[PDB]
Amino acid sequence: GAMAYGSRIGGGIDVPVPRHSVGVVIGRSGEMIKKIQNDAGVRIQFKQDDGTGPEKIAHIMGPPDRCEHAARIINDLLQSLRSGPPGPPGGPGMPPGGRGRGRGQG
RNA sequence: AGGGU
């Protein structure tokens, strides 16, 4: 939605986390989001699925300032995914594999 | 780094 007045925070904010980074920010064992909840002192609970965007909405509840703090931890964790871990192939570098050569020997 | 409660 065109929320031109979305500059106002509150006691619990809805943060848009990329759907390809949902498990990332929480961690495979949830150890990661516990750190976010720890360093911010907030209750971060992923909602079912608002579906109103290419992201997932997570309701970071708690004291507004801490919600901002918590939001930053998740957002920065996304920002660090942006060419953070360098990958030669797969991304900006197509592996020059042959036409089935290597596996297609017959 | 896919599910933490």
Structure token digits, residue A99: 């036409």
Crossing angle of helices A31-40 and A64-79, in 10° steps, is 140
Give residues with Cβ within 8 angstroms of A8, minimum separation 6: none
Distance A102 CA to B1 C1' (A): 31
Measure the CA–CA gap between A56 and A47, rounded to whole angstroms.
Answer: 8
CATH topology of domain A1-106: Ribosomal Protein S8; Chain: A, domain 1 (3.30.1370)
Measure the CA–CA gap between A102 and A49, rounded to whole angstroms.
Answer: 43
The A 16-35 residues near strand B by Cβ under 7 Å are 19-24, 26-30, 32-34
Per CA to C1' distance, which residue is closest to B3? A23
Identity of the residue numbered A31:
E
Residues facing residue A45 across a β-bridge: A59
CA A25 to chain centre: 5
Distance A42 CA to B3 C1' (A): 18
The C-alpha torsion from A47 through A51 and A54 to A59, rounded to 10°, is: -20
